[PDB]
Design an enzyme around this catalytic site. Structure first.
Site, PDB file in Angstrom:
ATOM      1  N   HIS A   1       5.585  48.586  46.558  1.00 22.65           N
ATOM      2  CA  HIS A   1       6.979  48.670  46.887  1.00 22.65           C
ATOM      3  C   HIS A   1       7.419  47.957  48.155  1.00 22.65           C
ATOM      4  O   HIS A   1       8.553  48.161  48.595  1.00 22.65           O
ATOM      5  CB  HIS A   1       7.413  50.132  47.002  1.00 22.65           C
ATOM      6  CG  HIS A   1       7.360  50.839  45.703  1.00 22.65           C
ATOM      7  ND1 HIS A   1       6.183  51.051  45.018  1.00 22.65           N
ATOM      8  CD2 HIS A   1       8.351  51.377  44.944  1.00 22.65           C
ATOM      9  CE1 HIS A   1       6.450  51.676  43.877  1.00 22.65           C
ATOM     10  NE2 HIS A   1       7.752  51.897  43.824  1.00 22.65           N
TER      11      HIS A   1
ATOM     12  N   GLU B   1      14.007  46.600  32.907  1.00 18.99           N
ATOM     13  CA  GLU B   1      14.378  45.441  33.774  1.00 18.99           C
ATOM     14  C   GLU B   1      14.517  44.116  33.013  1.00 18.99           C
ATOM     15  O   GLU B   1      15.560  43.444  33.060  1.00 18.99           O
ATOM     16  CB  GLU B   1      13.359  45.255  34.916  1.00 18.99           C
ATOM     17  CG  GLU B   1      13.640  46.127  36.197  1.00 18.99           C
ATOM     18  CD  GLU B   1      13.248  47.610  36.037  1.00 18.99           C
ATOM     19  OE1 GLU B   1      12.717  47.994  34.962  1.00 18.99           O
ATOM     20  OE2 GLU B   1      13.520  48.427  36.983  1.00 18.99           O
TER      21      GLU B   1
HETATM   22  C1  LIG Z   1       9.831  48.973  36.782  1.00 17.94           C
HETATM   23  C2  LIG Z   1      10.372  50.036  37.753  1.00 17.94           C
HETATM   24  N1  LIG Z   1      11.729  50.296  37.806  1.00 17.94           N
HETATM   25  C3  LIG Z   1      12.325  51.182  38.647  1.00 17.94           C
HETATM   26  C4  LIG Z   1      11.523  51.908  39.476  1.00 17.94           C
HETATM   27  C5  LIG Z   1      12.198  52.936  40.390  1.00 17.94           C
HETATM   28  N2  LIG Z   1      11.849  54.225  39.821  1.00 17.94           N
HETATM   29  C6  LIG Z   1      10.706  54.962  40.162  1.00 17.94           C
HETATM   30  S1  LIG Z   1      10.573  56.351  39.288  1.00 17.94           S
HETATM   31  C7  LIG Z   1      11.988  56.007  38.461  1.00 17.94           C
HETATM   32  C8  LIG Z   1      12.503  56.969  37.385  1.00 17.94           C
HETATM   33  C9  LIG Z   1      11.400  57.262  36.390  1.00 17.94           C
HETATM   34  O1  LIG Z   1      11.733  58.434  35.661  1.00 17.94           O
HETATM   35  P1  LIG Z   1      10.782  59.075  34.520  1.00 17.94           P
HETATM   36  O2  LIG Z   1       9.980  58.046  33.778  1.00 17.94           O
HETATM   37  O3  LIG Z   1      11.602  60.021  33.696  1.00 17.94           O
HETATM   38  O4  LIG Z   1       9.663  59.853  35.399  1.00 17.94           O
HETATM   39  P2  LIG Z   1       9.635  61.293  36.125  1.00 17.94           P
HETATM   40  O5  LIG Z   1       9.518  61.057  37.595  1.00 17.94           O
HETATM   41  O6  LIG Z   1      10.887  62.078  35.761  1.00 17.94           O
HETATM   42  O7  LIG Z   1       8.366  61.956  35.635  1.00 17.94           O
HETATM   43  C10 LIG Z   1      12.581  54.835  38.802  1.00 17.94           C
HETATM   44  C11 LIG Z   1      13.868  54.320  38.162  1.00 17.94           C
HETATM   45  C12 LIG Z   1      10.129  51.656  39.458  1.00 17.94           C
HETATM   46  N3  LIG Z   1       9.282  52.305  40.268  1.00 17.94           N
HETATM   47  N4  LIG Z   1       9.556  50.749  38.607  1.00 17.94           N
END
Ligand SMILES: Cc1ncc(C[n+]2csc(CCOP(=O)(O)OP(=O)(O)O)c2C)c(N)n1
Ligand SMILES: Cc1ncc(C[n+]2csc(CCOP(=O)(O)OP(=O)(O)O)c2C)c(N)n1
Ligand SMILES: [K+]
Ligand SMILES: [K+]
Ligand SMILES: [Mn+2]
Ligand SMILES: [Mn+2]
Lengths: 329, 363, 362, 329
Positions: free
Chosen positions: D128, D59
């Site tokens: 959230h 971000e």
């Molecule tokens: C700073 C932030 N940006 C965006 C989000 C929205 N979001 C939640 S999980 C996610 C993807 C995360 O993927 P990853 O780290 O690969 O985790 P996984 O669920 O695949 O284990 C996003 C973009 C968030 N919660 N926090």
């Protein structure tokens, strides 16, 4: 005994470090440099690498490290060099620290203190002059305080450290070098100021003047000038931004019938905004013989040039003027 | 019929970054450990599939991120650490909540938002805590510096405990993780940084998000190893090696677990726009972590097909009971809406939707 | 009869993920040399004058001086075009001059007068010029901004590059690593430059960074370490890094090993965390201006007397600028609210109470 | 016809993309995934990689890149998946974008738009659900808007893009799937809503009811109930948070003599606080026949459990209750 604000904060920390081995201080330049504004002077030489920890310039990272250490049971003091720089870290303060006890249903406390200078200074321009009182004040799960004088700063830093929840301590860089008479009760290692209680700095009968941090001293200068003309201001030093002591302001306005709020921050959605809104919603509203009005920083990013800066922060004459308007004098 | 007391298995060799020697490429599994890991992984799998069904019936709402396909990670990580070690992860945490010691009943009752949940319904899917388990964190990347600070506390207290700090492949591009790497290395924190790489960060594949997809090497000056996150024995061994490394005083280490999630990113993601159903089906048929352990155990005479089937029945019955509980359990009372804002404070009142609505807050 | 040009040895750069680096020889013309010498001397004397004015209290707040690092601003400018882009942090007075502002405008900005480049609104840390984006006071914040300027150069298709500078202390900011990843991913024409002067405020590189090889922190991004006391080294490295970005190969990191003679800012005496002997030795053996002067004189590109005449002319330019900066009036109070928003009709801005109103015009 | 809020925002962005090659969109899942909440559906297919850019989860970094591109003359739309995640990037919004034109003395404009859903949604819990309207509203150099219906969202996203300064567009996830009558004027590619101007969504004589975002629809429901009881509410949709249209609110209050503010965010130092303080400092104060009062979210981090969340956001019944308190009925 006169003690400067910076030394009173130093005493506060030093006394709490000696008292509790779980207490430690981290941030940029706090250790070997003796503090960016010398507030932590001598602490590293006394306590060592383990307790007083110089960090890289990595705000989000070291604030999250402090929050993590607190979750695990330690009692960190996380210094931001100024609060302008807390913006890089404010997700850790709000989402990792403030909300956690509530989210966890009371299983996980976060006994962290975030402290450092806040708001305007002298000639440091727009990225360096911001006040965060209203921003942090807005957030459930946090306590937010903002000392004015040396007693304020010592008693509040000690209360912050002893609190088991996140406490944001908004200091003021221009107050650091100001000496104050230091009562013998404030010299005690047991000196604490309760979070949530305002202090009446000057009794009066004609108008209630409420402020926080540096401007409290300007409100007092204003009341000294005004009482030569027969006008008696009751000056209230908030001490705490959240949870604010509305009860003390209300009882004052029920006596004086008039209210001016004074702050260094930006006016819109500011600290004065909440005080006015509460006075209108509360039991003192009918006691008001004139509207409550706000004295604030000017509604601009802080300019550098001296005359523009002078006119972007409340001056004693601005306070006197709002009081005279309020009293129709 | 006599069963073997133990058997030796070959585990995939880890790729290494800044390490001369990595975990062993064989390991001994006892019958008893086999049976225990098998029951744990099956418990996590059945709980997750129950959560899916509850969510579709609207009994769970908001966020629900499932970890099926990844059970070799929570269970193998648990198998490599002490109960007195520490662990923190992001929101895809139901399996970790269980391996770290919460009951399926408390977990599911928290998902269903009932008073019997581990936070009495305050937290829901993303925020569950247990002793030595620090969530359960919904802001991407944020738990990495927290985990580094939990390691600093371990070092500060001098108890030879370590902290496992988990983040996904998408999270791996968060700035604060790099800030954490630098401080952990500088201070020699006993922090095992763990990248759980299931190939996608929400809908974004690793190749579209990361200029380098070698997650075990992103620590740069921090050594790392890359581990088969479908193989519970591979994960356990890497973990034992990483924890031994941090306990020896050598500072932080990165472990990348190559794993896979069968579900979408969350219940709101069908999981098909950015990958094929065949990719998922081929990962399942070739590498399912439960199937892998079951085959090792049967082929090596550590357990019978009938013993493992009986554990499956026992576990599915447990999850049916747990779901009955979570679905019947009353919601928390309204009067506790304000509770647990601050620790160790006197009671106070919280404003509701207008100034005439007042909630009591007690610690 | 002077030489029209001469060939000089320059130190070989350390390389990270590059099979070849900048050349180890360069040609310097008499003309270019007199130019670089003049620019570096102008920067040096401007900084010394700012120190004076600060001590006289004519400048206040922040004043971070770049004396000792003149091979960086002048060397970087020598290796790029006027149409290329540059962004740095707050130690920016030199780059403000090399990117084309006058000493008058720079010093009048420091003294907070209406003749300043920002009309006294910005002070030391916030000065802008065509293709020069500040002058940024929040550490590391300018790095994603530079990558974005590089994003725009690629979008616009004109083969321009952006030089994106941060100090050693800044190098541990997470957003810099976020920027490296996206610049690599999108092959942005961004040259990431770590100006390593050994200290981030009061914290030495060894105490802040687990690894002090800044040119390698980009990891998957290639890097070079360069002698930032040697204007010819800097120029050659910059020409190489810009050609690299112009060819479409994406971002590259250049670490400039350099040194600041003053403290971190006017408030920092600069001696609690390093010795006066350390500073004196750097300055005595590797001052960027003396290094060039020696090169020019010993290779017959110019005479001791020529360079002394440049010194006298620069001194008059700095003296004239200082006289202007000290006599120029403050901006008028009526303009306090000006330029809050671009391209909007006038509006009113609240002052310190509701009865104080300032007109805001774009 | 009826057009949902999500589709009106999509229309606005599509039109502005077609109108100006310098406009582009970046953020997490905007492109190939068709948007985290499908607000950018079809755009990447139409415009390509150069214009609709999926980003890593970085971000601070991608917000900073967007601000740099705007400084170099591009016109980026930077999507935060929710404004909760903007906390990571908030220094770029405030210190790099908001303050830059002023600091530079009007030399460097920053034509960037930050958009994304803001506030509460359904069962997403405390990290959230946070509303950032008062935080962003506080800051000089920013414009801040908060659409309610399809017309609002289209006209304000178009105005934000055409603006030359940083504009924060605080959307609402629960509004995205809501259909509204979309008049001919709104269907046009020239449709713009001026930033700074509220709209009266319902004329009334008894009380002024002022809101932003989703709760505007709750105010209209409340007024529909009250109308059957002889009480006529004048309902004001702010549309803009900074600079708010206080004149419209003032003219209403001088007619109705009564004011209730309604918002979904936290109360203290919130949006209602500022309206309440302005109404008291301004010419309308003497037209009040009762104190102005505020209806807000509960002052807690957002709980997960349905019954708890239901009682943490303003309901139609809480708006009606506040109104009847104010009218003394
Ligand atoms: C700073 C932030 N940006 C965006 C989000 C929205 N979001 C939640 S999980 C996610 C993807 C995360 O993927 P990853 O780290 O690969 O985790 P996984 O669920 O695949 O284990 C996003 C973009 C968030 N919660 N926090
Ligand atoms: C985010 C942030 N944290 C702290 C500061 C205070 N600060 C200003 S400059 C500085 C030191 C930076 O050092 P370095 O990056 O090495 O740059 P140099 O001045 O040596 O070129 C610090 C800590 C700041 N401006 N911004
Ligand atoms: K504390
Ligand atoms: K715009
Ligand atoms: Mn993933
Ligand atoms: Mn430095």
């Amino acid at each position: 005994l006169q003690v400067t604000v910076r030394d009173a904060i130093n005493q506060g920390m030093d006394e709490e470090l000696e008292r509790d081995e779980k207490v430690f201080l981290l941030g940029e330049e706090v250790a070997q440099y003796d503090g960016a504004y010398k507030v932590s002077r001598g602490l590293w030489k006394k306590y060592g690498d383990k307790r007083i920890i110089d960090t890289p310039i990595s705000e989000m990272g070291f604030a999250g490290i402090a929050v993590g250490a607190a979750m695990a049971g330690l009692r960190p003091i996380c210094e931001f060099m100024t609060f302008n720089f807390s913006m890089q870290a404010i997700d850790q303060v709000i989402n990792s620290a403030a909300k956690t006890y509530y989210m966890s249903g009371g299983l996980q406390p976060v006994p962290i203190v975030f402290r450092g200078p806040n708001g305007a200074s002298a000639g440091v321009a727009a990225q360096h002059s911001q006040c965060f009182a209203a921003w942090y004040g807005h957030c459930p799960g946090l306590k937010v305080v903002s000392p004015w004088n040396s007693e304020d700063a010592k008693g509040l830093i000690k209360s912050a450290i002893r609190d088991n929840n996140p406490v944001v301590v908004l200091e003021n860089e221009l107050m650091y070098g100001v000496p104050f008479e230091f009562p013998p009760e404030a010299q005690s290692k047991d000196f604490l100021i309760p979070i949530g209680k305002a202090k009446i700095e000057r009794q009066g009968t004609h108008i209630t003047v409420v402020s926080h941090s540096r401007p409290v001293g300007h409100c007092l200068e204003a009341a000294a000038v005004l009482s030569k003309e027969g006008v008696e201001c009751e000056v209230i030093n908030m001490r705490t931004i959240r949870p604010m002591d509305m009860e003390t302001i209300e009882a004052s306005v029920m006596k004086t019938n008039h209210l001016v709020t004074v702050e260094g921050g930006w006016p819109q959605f500011g600290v004065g905004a909440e005080i006015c809104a509460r006075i209108m919603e509360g039991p003192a509203f009918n006691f008001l013989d004139a509207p409550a009005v706000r004295v604030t920083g000017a509604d601009v990013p802080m300019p550098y040039a001296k005359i523009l800066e002078d006119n972007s922060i409340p001056q004693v004459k601005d306070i006197i003027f709002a009081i005279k308007k309020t009293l129709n004098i | 019929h006599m069963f073997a007391n133990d058997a030796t298995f070959e585990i995939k060799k880890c790729d290494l970054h800044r390490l001369e020697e990595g975990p062993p490429v064989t390991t001994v599994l006892t019958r008893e450990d086999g049976l225990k890991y098998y029951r744990m992984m099956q418990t996590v799998r059945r709980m997750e599939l129950k959560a899916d069904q509850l969510y579709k019936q609207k009994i769970i709402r908001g966020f629900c991120h499932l970890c099926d396909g990844q059970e070799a990670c929570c269970v193998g990580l648990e198998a490599g650490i002490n109960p007195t070690d520490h662990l923190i992860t992001a929101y895809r945490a139901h399996g970790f909540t269980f391996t770290r010691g919460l009951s399926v009943r408390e977990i599911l009752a928290e998902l269903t938002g009932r008073k019997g949940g581990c936070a009495k319904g305050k937290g829901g899917s993303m925020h569950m805590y247990a002793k030595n388990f620090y969530g359960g964190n919904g802001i991407v990347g944020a738990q990495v510096p927290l985990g580094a600070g939990i390691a600093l506390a371990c070092k500060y207290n001098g108890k030879d405990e370590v902290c496992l700090t988990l983040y996904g492949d998408g999270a791996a591009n968060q700035g604060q993780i790099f800030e954490a790497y630098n401080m952990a290395a500088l201070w020699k924190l006993p922090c095992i940084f763990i990248c759980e790489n299931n190939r996608y960060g929400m809908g974004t594949s690793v190749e579209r998000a990361a200029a380098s997809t070698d997650y075990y090497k992103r620590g740069d000056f921090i050594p790392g190893l890359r581990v088969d996150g479908m193989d519970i024995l591979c994960v356990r061994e890497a973990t034992r090696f990483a924890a031994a490394y941090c306990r020896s005083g050598k500072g932080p280490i990165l472990m990348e677990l190559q794993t896979y999630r069968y579900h979408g990113h969350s219940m709101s993601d069908p999981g098909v726009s950015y990958r094929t159903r065949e990719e998922i089906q081929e990962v399942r048929s070739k590498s399912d972590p439960i199937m892998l352990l079951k085959d090792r155990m049967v082929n090596s005479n550590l357990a019978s097909v009938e013993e493992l089937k009986e554990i499956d029945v026992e576990v599915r019955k447990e999850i049916e009971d747990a779901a009955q509980f979570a679905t019947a359990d009353p919601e928390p009372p309204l009067e506790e809406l304000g509770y647990h804002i601050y620790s160790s404070d006197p009671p106070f009142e919280v404003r509701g939707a207008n100034q005439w609505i007042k909630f009591k807050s007690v610690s």
